[model samples]
Target: SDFSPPEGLEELLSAPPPDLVAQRHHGWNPKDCSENIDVKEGGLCFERRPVAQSTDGVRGKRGYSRGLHAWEISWPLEQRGTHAVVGVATALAPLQADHYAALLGSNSESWGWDIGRGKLYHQSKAPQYPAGEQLVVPERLLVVLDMEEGTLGYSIGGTYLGPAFRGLKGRTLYPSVSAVWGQCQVRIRYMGE
Candidate 1:
């Protein structure tokens, strides 16, 4: 199935191009940390923990909290390999106007330290649809970390309904980094290994 944007969607696409550099640094980071790191093969890992109010929100009304959630690779102690980290969230029920998803990445010691410090580097509106229906968006969340600058790239795609329960949102959906869980198995090939 193919999805065509609304009649006047051209205006939305005409906006200024996104600044990938700025999007990745929205989170906190340390001052003395070196900005150099490289993402190596099999370097990606996933961590799934119960979303807490300190992190998620109160009563599942504020932040991402309502389903399986996970965070990507963490920075090394020395910040040599890759000083970047990524986080993701999703829900089982169809996305409502109030529900939303976000992609966050940063290296600021203040952001990466203790708990709840990473800034919201990037964010995407949750897929909207009518309530009382089970909708599988199929890996609708994603985050890409840049080892060098301790940054992240984010994107999302999934089907959804309109405010009036009109129709499906999108037809084609793509795989995302949040797909894997508990023990990283994915691999990456370095140049001329």
Candidate 2:
């Protein structure tokens, strides 16, 4: 079915809603380490490394620590084999010595079309070679969880993308899972000439 938003919602498309603004402020900043990383000359890379603090004394004891934390990077589209691949990476350290990273890529399309209506496909799996990591690719396929209100629900290509948790589809493109915090990288690549 056609999933474009009804006419007259263009103004709201410029920024997120109040709840999203608050979400953005919840320990979120544009000047974090992810933004400081240098995007390599040919490819771009964004990284997120998060650090946590803990105290071992007493039941209510508290401790604090800091280090290079969670980061995200985006790169322009590049050709890879039969298709273009944009690359993104994120790092998270929920606890000392326990770190996880993820990488993902998406198909790049022209600007005028509506992403809400366009078909999206993606794949997420533990990255090979690196071991103990996850990778996302459009070639794997993406499933739509929901298409109501312009919000396209999605999951890995093979699995159901799932339903819209909140907000209107055309009004906001961001997802709404609070506990799902980590680093995210996004790249767009073209399929052919």
Candidate 3:
């Protein structure tokens, strides 16, 4: 069974969404992405090429050190191959790796929820997120980062999955993802503060 909501989670998710002008300023930082990723749509979207036995990723233009942040991630379920992961990462997180794996959360600098394998990863530890449930891949995932409280979680439609990672205080975390599928397109939109 999935865990219940932690204290104070409801209030954070209830905040209003950001307007268009504010959202435009936030997106993927093309210059910070991996070579295997092709950034497009003026840094709002990106695609990962088929790099044999390798994983690649990208980070957002903005980093959060304090406060709550949310972004909506959209990726076609059919296009998500092995290691399709989304989460948060510090600047020290690696953008590229030679071996096909969940690079987003491979080190202490990042946390990732792997859609391809139905798991969560951090510091090289892979555990099943949502505990004992049959995984259902969604076309859209709303990722929330509470830097003030140091936690990360996801919301599918109106359902919040609860905090999946924690102990992230005092670090600047950027929205990030890693992929292994060929031509997998991913889009991101900043929701709000």
Candidate 4:
């Protein structure tokens, strides 16, 4: 499906734009990933292990500091046991949390959407997003990042869900995800802005 700008984000496009054609250099970083994160498909996909009750995560090799960017995260519902989080994180974010929690958004370095719970997490709390609805996660979730404006949003299937976080301007953010489910595989694709 074609990429659709989320609600209230039609004006964040850059003037000169980016190398939309080249579309190179975006994938999960095998070296920086957590021990439970099994990076596969030459960094395009990953599977998480149910080891030691911990939250394992991975970040992309490239960090986006400016302009608009998007990435598609493909993780089927059956593979998502629980704490299936997907979002953006700064380099300082913890890729491995001892407890099985939403590791990405447990601190200020990341922003996350809890797929099964329909909750957004940041800095140990979700100030803007409600945290109770249990949603049926789709096969793919499109993460839209507006680096220039510092906002993050998601699109499921084709419906835009609006911005989930803001105030991310100065951070060098990377596409990140944390999983607690065993054998949960995720695939990523960089969608140009």
Candidate 5:
């Protein structure tokens, strides 16, 4: 079935976009290790170890510093206290932290999308959000990194949400995720090249 697009979507009709979805370079990167986190189905899904208060982060085995790439993540739509944070980060980003402070986007090297707060996190805080943009843990999330444009953005259910971060030109950004035992579990797929 066709995606029930947003009412004001601008995906272009005549141009119709080159390729919407392509074969994923990979599902996830097992080598991008975060201790105690599970990489299952060849890096397709991520889940916490069932230990209370355990927070984990993982990176994509494949990295990108240049070019436009898109990917999709799916999880339970309903919030269970909290949910996983997803985005890109440098290899220097840590993989595990027991408390929420260690969460992705809680530091300088990582940029993550928070499920509960519905904010973009970086440098240990959320820089900002679009006017009236109130994202509520949508079941499916879109992460689009435009290295060529030196920026990144996200979408949900098929609607482009808006830019999450910029200044993505110099360093390689790997697909990353952070999830707790009961929150933030997810599956990721490369949407296209």
Candidate 6:
């Protein structure tokens, strides 16, 4: 009979989601997005206007070469647009390369997803995926980057989509996204484990 238990102490003992400081794009180029993109909440909300150039991209405030990190992008389900791409890239990755490859993947060093096309892309190689899931409403994308594991993956509304890329061991990768004309806009949130 040493220490007495405090009332309702167990409630506070539960572990909550870890603290985070997400949203901070080191660079954002409004290349084709009507030049109408804006970042709020420390760069968490990246919203763009309709119709502009073919492709444009924005980079996270920073990138990591080690450790595990993750983030999510959300938007109104009814707001699906033309072409929306999400992925991870290094500082060397081009933001305005071309209407086709500028968004996420498109080069050997970078890896990304073409949500509009439902494909995983790398170095101009787009691997077709079974995207018949309707992509969800305002669809959500949770991208996980594990530098330690040298892998990257994402989840749709919490449903894991498997590994999207690997062999990213020594690379310093940043969270990046791109979009074209239409309603496919999104907001981001960083979740750290």
Best by lDDT: 3
Question: lDDT values of the candidates?
Answer: 0.21, 0.21, 0.83, 0.78, 0.68, 0.61
Q: List the residue pairs that clash in candidate 6.
A: 24-61, 25-61, 26-60, 26-61, 32-53, 76-138, 77-137, 77-138
Better of 1 and 2 by TM-score: 2
Clashes (candidate 4): 0
TM-scores, each model vs. reference: 0.22, 0.24, 0.89, 0.84, 0.80, 0.74
Query: Mind giving the per-residue lDDT tens digits that candidate 4 earns over 1-193?
Result: 2344653344433334334333336878888799888788767788887686788999987899988888779998898867888899988888997887878788888999888777788888454332244456689887899888888888775666767887988889999998887877899877665
What would the per-residue lDDT of candidate 2 be over residues 1-193, giving only the tens digit for each residue?
1233222222332234334223233212232223222222122222222222210000001111211011111212121212221211112211111222111211111101112222222233222211132434333322121224332233232333333222323321211111102232322111110
| lDDT string, candidate 6, 60-161, tens digits | 776879877766767554554555678888877766533534456777767877666668878874676433346442367767777887877776643556
Candidate 6 lDDT at 133 equals: 44
Ten residues in sequence with the least summed lDDT for candidate 6: 1-10
The candidate maximizing TM-score is 3
Clashes of 5: 3
Residue ranges of candidate 5 with Cα displaced over 4 Å: 1-25, 78-80, 132-134, 183-185
| Of candidates 3 and 1, the better by lDDT | 3
Q: What is the Å distance of residue 142 in model 1 from its true position?
A: 9.5
Worst 10 residues of 1 by lDDT: 53-62
**Off by more than 4 A, model 2:** 1-45, 53-148, 174-193
lDDT of 5 by residue, 61-180 (tens): 778887667777887755334646778888898888867543788888888877567768788745545326464657777777877776767777656666678787898888888776
lDDT of 1 at 115: 10
lDDT of model 5 at position 46: 68
C-alpha lDDT (0 to 100) for residue 131 of candidate 6: 30
Q: What C-alpha RMSD separates each model from the true structure?
A: 16.4, 15.8, 2.5, 4.4, 5.1, 8.8
